[PDB]
């Protein structure tokens, strides 16, 4: 048993890497927001 | 004052002050709270 | 609240020392038992020599 594993991820870093910035167009459960940028 | 806070200048507890269950500020301690059953089946029992 | 805490603490301490008293009584009873066993063993030693 290694207490470190599994390593807790960084969701901020994961979103930055994946490009998860938003959906300006809107989805089934999301909203067409003009303020959001870079997607 | 809080329990962890300083009690240096807290008011002294009077000699006549009663720090027990009977002096808890509850409805049973409230003077004009008529807890005895005036009307009801338990009142009928108390009338026996 | 503080008075209730202190009351429980004092009563618990008294009961704990009464428990300590009875535990020491039974420990002393065991000690006396093994003292008597040792005395019996010594007496048996002199009897065997005799």
């Amino acid at each position: 048993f290694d207490p470190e594993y599994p390593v807790p991820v960084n969701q901020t870093a994961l979103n930055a890497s994946r490009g998860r910035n938003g959906v300006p167009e809107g989805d089934q459960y999301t909203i067409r927001n003009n303020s959001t940028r870079e997607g | 004052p809080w329990s962890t806070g300083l009690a240096t200048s807290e008011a002294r507890k009077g000699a006549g002050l009663d720090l027990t269950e009977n002096n808890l500020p509850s409805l049973k301690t409230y003077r004009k709270a008529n807890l005895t059953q005036t009307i009801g089946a338990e009142a009928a029992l108390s009338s026996m | 609240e503080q008075e209730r805490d202190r009351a429980f603490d004092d009563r618990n301490e008294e009961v704990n020392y009464r428990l300590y008293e009875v535990e020491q009584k039974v420990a002393e009873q065991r000690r006396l038992m093994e003292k008597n066993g040792a005395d019996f063993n010594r007496a048996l030693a002199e009897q065997q020599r005799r």
Partner: protein
Amino acid sequence: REIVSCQAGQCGNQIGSKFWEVISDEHGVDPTGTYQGDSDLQLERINVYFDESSGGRYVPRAVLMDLEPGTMDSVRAGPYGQLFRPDNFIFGQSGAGNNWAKGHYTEGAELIDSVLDVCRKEAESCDCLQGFQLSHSLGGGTGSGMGTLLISKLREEYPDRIMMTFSVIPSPRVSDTVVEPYNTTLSVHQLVENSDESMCIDNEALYDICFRTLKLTTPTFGDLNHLVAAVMSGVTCCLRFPGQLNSDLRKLAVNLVPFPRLHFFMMGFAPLTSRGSQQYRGLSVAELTQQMFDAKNMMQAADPRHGRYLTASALFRGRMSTKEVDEQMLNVQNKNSSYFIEWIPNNIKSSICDIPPKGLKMSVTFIGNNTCIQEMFRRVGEQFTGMFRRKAFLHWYTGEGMDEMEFTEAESNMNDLVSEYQQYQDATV
């Protein structure tokens, strides 16, 4: 809500004797059975463990199972021995001989008729039965074999009742038989599918509690069994007494079992302190949390730092506040999150009961589904593999009619359970 108690084997009967000691003390019942309570509350839920007798007294709803009448006689001669109903004692001419095969197929098979007769008899007398609480030892013959037979064959008749099992597990350091792996494996791969929840006590951890915490010079099985009896009572304290935040066996199972196979728990009790060390420590929920989450307070000889917590439950007893009791759980989860599973948020379920144990301002029983419980299973499975590989001590089990494939089935089920306990321990999100 009714719980029927069954004590199997020497260990089970001794644990049950001391459990009825503590329960009679908590409910104000003398050895003669007459009620000497000091408030309404004791009598108001006395039906949970005691069936009301004729003359205002109470008889425990306990069934004593042992192929050896010796432990039966010791229980009867105990100070509260006369409390139990006479016909509830069931015994045979010869004992199981420390054999799971003898206790489960040959010697325990004749007396199982009367045992089921008594258990069924105690079943309809309950207005709404909650479950069956069986206390036994996995390494024995009567307690393991016959006890697990009862566990398996009561689920068929009563599938909707909580089946709670106090299993006194063995330990290689604490080895007081030579067929501990065989007996405990045969018991466990039955308890896996026949017990709603199975909490495990190790005599090594009981001895260590006496060593470290109680610091008793000569603690005997009476003191040793009080530790487990206190927890057996504190699990159903919420059943027997009102509380700010109530719970029952089913609620404990719901909040402690994420997957039905994973229902093996390691338990701890607080407060616990030697008589001389109680003066330096203030009794509060803040100290109770530290005592629970201190690994030396476990009744399992496994280190919680060696695994993660699938779930945890703290049955607090005593007058306290509902704010800091949850503050402690939040703090411990957050600050030992490396030891708590991430995808199960708020791993600890806390229940509060108003009435504490007699003599304690506030106490708590801990029930933890720690993933470190796999350590005992892996160790004793390795011992079982070592013994079965060279065919040691087989003839006793095999000449009783058992098949060679039963041990392989048990080994497979044990390795499988260890496999879930590991693959959900190291699981990601």
